[PDB]
Amino acid sequence: GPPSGKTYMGWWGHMGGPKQKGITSYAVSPYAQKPLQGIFHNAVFNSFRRFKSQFLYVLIPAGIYWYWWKNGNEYNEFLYSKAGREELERVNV
Amino acid sequence: SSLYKTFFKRNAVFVGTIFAGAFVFQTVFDTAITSWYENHNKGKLWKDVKARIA
Amino acid sequence: EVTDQLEDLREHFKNTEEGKALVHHYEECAERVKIQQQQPGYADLEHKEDCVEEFFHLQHYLDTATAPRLFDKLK
Amino acid sequence: EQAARAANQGALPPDLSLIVKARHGGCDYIFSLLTGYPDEPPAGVALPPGSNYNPYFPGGSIAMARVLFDDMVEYEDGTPATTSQMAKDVTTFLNWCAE
Amino acid sequence: MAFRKSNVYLSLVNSYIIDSPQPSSINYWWNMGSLLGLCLVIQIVTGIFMAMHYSSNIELAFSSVEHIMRDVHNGYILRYLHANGASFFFMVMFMHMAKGLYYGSYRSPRVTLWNVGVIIFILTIATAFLGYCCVYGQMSHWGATVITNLFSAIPFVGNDIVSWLWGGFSVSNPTIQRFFALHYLVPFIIAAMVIMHLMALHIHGSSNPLGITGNLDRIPMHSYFIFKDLVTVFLFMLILALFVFYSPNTLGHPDNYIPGNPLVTPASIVPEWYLLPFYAILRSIPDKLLGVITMFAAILVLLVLPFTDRSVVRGNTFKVLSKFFFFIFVFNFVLLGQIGACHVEVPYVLMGQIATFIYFAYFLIIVPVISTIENVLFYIGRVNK
Amino acid sequence: MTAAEHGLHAPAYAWSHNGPFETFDHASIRRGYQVYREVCAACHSLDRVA
Ligand SMILES: CCCCCCCCCCC(=O)OC[C@H](COP(=O)(O)OC[C@H](O)COP(=O)(O)OC[C@@H](COC(=O)CC)OC(=O)CCC)OC(=O)CCCCCCCC
Ligand SMILES: CCCCCCCCCCCCCCCCCC(=O)OC[C@H](COP(=O)(O)OCCN)OC(=O)CCCCCCCCCCCCC
Ligand code: HEM
Ligand code: HEM
């Protein structure tokens, strides 16, 4: 077939990024490393840092929507009781 | 030292040991679960009731 | 010789401190319904008072005390 | 179904092969229904003719009447056949019919 | 060259699951799309093995599903794995889509990939509805009644498309026989949308949680992301097995074990749990015609999101205000499901009218306004004048 | 709705088949069929059991 429209990604040898000069990388084999020394000092010390950074953006919305749900229940509980029969008659019509 | 050149090196060693070892795992694994299940619920089963009213 | 087990527990917990109060709140309320439609205006009135809620309050408590105990007495 | 209603004052008794799975509560509801008939309804409720009070039934008025009284069967193995005992067995038998 | 690169058929497998270049920093949220491919394989296989014992006639349908549960060897495993498998299929899709909302995967150059996804979501709601009716329980009969009668409000063609869907004058035997035949078909249309979906991903690749280019650091798929996908596959099967073998009727309704009876109505007619947010948007509008338009608009409003995001940064990683309002939208979607499982009663009518405004206002008023604010907040915090 | 229209909540008894490792008590099933044949079967069917 023919070539198609060009993209923002290529393949191995020509990936389309900028040219690199002056960066050096080092590594070691897995067979030469001690087994999984990365589970602990990571499930307590690091996992707590990750929790403390982001828990405020979830729990303030959750607190708003859960408080709104309970006040709706308790009011519906009350309207269909014997004490809340007179208020049920008004807010319907 | 020799625990690789005959036990792991090949993988006609290790497809054959895996597939062959999977069959004896099932028959041994099933007998052990079925014995623990029936002993944990002994007295409730039918064979225990049938043995109490002959 | 052996009477039913659930009435023995239902009667025992009606002497509970919580069980003594929930009885009389249902009774005093039964005496109120004796009159309110006995008066004229029998079936043309808009509504009239039952005592279903006071009966549910006693029954619900009596059921949370006898449920975890009963099946140890049955065979 | 025409003959079933003719013998029960218009109400139809359902099939019980799936009653444990087709009700909210399961085995706890079937048992409490049978042991839950009071001997006099609460003050105020006016029952239609041919119905009985059971507070576990939605509405509080059910066409079935009480059918379990003490020592109406004699068991082979010799267990005392009280009201609570017979109820525990039918609800265990009927769950096996569903599962 | 290697044989896997020169052969016509293996070259496609190599280019997609072996040598495909991937960003090194993608996290476990990028594993949900492989699970959705396993879900579709589970459903198509289990359903074909049940279809050998099923009967679609309205007098035989309910009793044929019980014949599968009692008489067929390993038949209760087939069904419960099928009924609970669909609830797991929808839960992984809500997480897949919410991921794209967060990291900006809908933006250019991946707009066409996001639009083919919205088509898959429509075809999967349709498939699940048609199969719930093949049971012909009490919820199966009255759910098809109230949904097919919504197309009666379309002006001048409403009463003719309903009699054409039903094949008569009510939900009846032509209705159940045609719902089963369409239900086998549509899963194979979904499988072709998935092929088109992957083709649109191969030309630009995946994004990453930082929202910048990934062409500077790439690793291949084989033995890094094949074995990272294997971690979540065995967790999926473990949690599914716990539901199929220990709690197989917790995510369903009891009234569907009663056979369908058109003379007796149930006290509460509700769908499955995953159509409840959309069932509550319908009841919020007090006019019949406008409620049907609004229910469908709630699915097609996802298509205007590439145009209302006015940010020069991709994703919500470095955005304070867009993080807070992403989670307002999530918990508003859960409250819509709760409202849809309640009675039409005070105050559950006003609660569902305010919460359906917050659903449409997020896409159209909130995103373009705070995205403009965040652009200008980055500028003045750095530039000295 | 009103509590009388929804019905009373059935309590939680301790059934011997509750739990992930427990079976039915098969002496109660046999004992329970006797209660079906002599009380219930006058007015109830069991059409799906062979
Ligand atoms: C009902 C049907 C569901 C069945 C499918 C279940 C799969 C759901 C997965 C949802 C998800 O994608 O959340 C991903 C998020 C992790 O984000 P991350 O890449 O930064 O963490 C990498 C980790 O640190 C390295 O962990 P590592 O690579 O070393 O090992 C992974 C292993 C856990 O290892 C441990 O012993 C503890 C470290 O297994 C797994 O973690 C399995 C994956 C859950 O998970 C989190 O831990 C935090 C987010 C909580 C999500 C809750 C909301 C969803 C409802
Ligand atoms: C059509 C509309 C579809 C909408 C469907 C909505 C329901 C979908 C439920 C899933 C919502 C969450 C999926 C989207 C989140 C993906 C991104 C993410 O991970 O969340 C951001 C947060 C922190 O991630 P970071 O900022 O650190 O990113 C860099 C990571 N290396 O990571 C987190 O902290 C995740 C915390 C999630 C907690 C909220 C759980 C939501 C489930 C509520 C269930 C309520 C009971 C049913
Ligand atoms: C131990 C014996 C019995 C058991 C366990 C039993 C079980 C049940 C159950 C579970 C229901 C349905 C309740 C509901 O839907 O909430 C029912 C309904 C009914 N049963 Fe029974 N049954 C028994 C015996 C009888 C007998 C002897 C009769 C004789 C007339 C009878 C007549 C009815 C009727 C008329 C209904 C319909 C209730 C209504 O529509 O209001 N039952 N039964
Ligand atoms: C995307 C794929 C599929 C989805 C999401 C899906 C969904 C469903 C659902 C939700 C039900 C009702 C479950 C219940 O409560 O019993 C159902 C029933 C059924 N489906 Fe599927 N289905 C899919 C594929 C298939 C296929 C390909 C077949 C092939 C015949 C099939 C055959 C059946 C049958 C026979 C039933 C009725 C038996 C039963 O109730 O389990 N399904 N389907």
Ligand code: HEM
């Ligand atoms: C049967 C249903 C689906 C299947 C099998 C599927 C499959 C996949 C796969 C394998 C990926 C690449 C890996 C990944 O990003 O997790 C992907 C990415 C993506 N999917 Fe889906 N998908 C499905 C449904 C959807 C839906 C419903 C949407 C949106 C409405 C969607 C939108 C996207 C987007 C935007 C991406 C790219 C994310 C990124 O690169 O950051 N897909 N899909």
Ligand SMILES: COc1c(O)c(C)c(C/C=C(/C)CC/C=C(\C)CC/C=C(\C)CC/C=C(\C)CC/C=C(\C)CCC=C(C)C)c(O)c1OC
């Ligand atoms: C981002 O990196 C990725 C990536 O991580 C992944 C996983 C994939 C691959 C992802 C997928 C989701 C795979 C696609 C899966 C499908 C399209 C599912 C298709 C499923 C079918 C067509 C079902 C086939 C089932 C049968 C034929 C049933 C057989 C039944 C029999 C034999 C029973 C016999 C009896 C009767 C009555 C017929 C990528 O393409 C990719 O991009 C590079």
Ligand SMILES: CCCCCCCCCCCCCCCCCC(=O)O[C@H](COC(=O)CCCCCC)COP(=O)(O)OCCN
């Ligand atoms: C959208 C539909 C899916 C399209 C296909 C994509 C998914 C790939 C399918 C799965 C891959 C398996 C392909 C087998 C690889 C070997 C092919 C091969 O050896 O090519 C052929 C022989 O293949 C055959 O005999 C028929 C193939 C049967 C296909 C089985 C269904 C060898 O031909 P070769 O490339 O060596 O050159 C000619 C030398 N005489």
Ligand SMILES: CCCCCCCCCCCCCCCCCC(=O)O[C@H](COC(=O)CCCCCC)COP(=O)(O)OCCN
């Ligand atoms: C009969 C069973 C069906 C199986 C075959 C599937 C074909 C269904 C077509 C689905 C259309 C998908 C459109 C969603 C994306 C829209 C956004 C976009 O810009 O993409 C569209 C993609 O459109 C198509 O996919 C149709 C091409 C035919 C496919 C032949 C393999 C841009 O391309 P296109 O030019 O085709 O659309 C604009 C028309 N001027």
